[PDB]
Symmetry: D2
Subunit: 103 residues, 4 copies
């Protein structure tokens, strides 16, 4: 329910940042994952959410996985990152303040 | 289309695209590489590799902002041709 | 030089470059962003953000291969200008 | 002695791949590290060395670190990756075969 897999090169960065914010709001945590070239996206989303006070990381796992590859004839190996973020203590205030709604 | 490589698969290893570019140059002489957004880095790297290792010469490198059904994304389009060393490098491989 | 941002520092957060571009546009109207190789992805992303969020319009996007004292690297050069909404977005911030 | 930090945007990818090969040849292992945008480089070097039979990973650590930042006035947070690779059992044969020197 709260998992985001980054793989669509058509999506703007803020699609993923905003989805991560929505999932943290709904579920308290969010899991981001990506392979290969998409790892830079997950890293950047995480940096943004940390530097701007929205999130605290709970788990960052990075590993090499086998990917089935028909044309190759045997699996290819790719790096995969998996990041779990939880809501920070400032998340609600910051989401409020975005729209000048802090009390 | 036949000699165009669109880079959009995060499951592929880099060398998939490097080798595909070399195979396309063997048949068509020239090769078009295109990508959006986060995939531009791969196209750039493919190009650098083919240039630095003596396989290719660039003919055209176009970067622009495009609308996707709308959101805006950067798109790169690179056209490469065989270098004077290409055939000998391929034979040596 | 004064209104050019070279992206080459891996220690910087993305929003360093996004905010610097916005500050430069406030003073100069327009801003040049440049990078090599692995940094091109950052320039692309900065640009997409400034376009998608209504701050900027692109005027020029140049990608080329350059010699570095030699090895060849891709280099992007983007020029942005303020959009019609820029001043109001900055005031609202 | 065997550490490679990826941070120079002037370097071609194969500078890092070839340095990693040299360090594995000399020391049996190599440590690759990078922050932020440079993580994609380390990931790609690792994929290359794995898919092509040169290396086996031993450790991949990915974390958020504080970076001193004068202009900011307090530290910024960046993702950092640290990858330790060791020579594979095929490394020597492959380095030989590169130059048609296998026996
Ligand atoms: K309120
Ligand atoms: K094709
Ligand atoms: K400047
Ligand atoms: K021999």
């Amino acid at each position: 329910k709260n998992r985001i897999q980054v793989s669509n090169t058509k999506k703007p960065l803020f699609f993923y940042v905003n989805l991560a914010k929505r999932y943290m709001q709904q579920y308290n945590d969010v899991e981001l994952s990506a392979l290969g070239m998409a790892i830079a996206t997950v890293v950047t989303v995480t940096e943004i959410l940390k530097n701007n006070g929205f999130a605290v990381e709970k788990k960052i796992m990075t590993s090499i996985v086998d990917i089935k590859d028909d044309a190759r004839g045997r699996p290819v190996q790719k790096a995969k990152i998996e990041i779990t973020l939880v809501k920070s203590e400032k998340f609600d205030e910051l989401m409020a303040a975005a729209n000048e709604e802090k009390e």
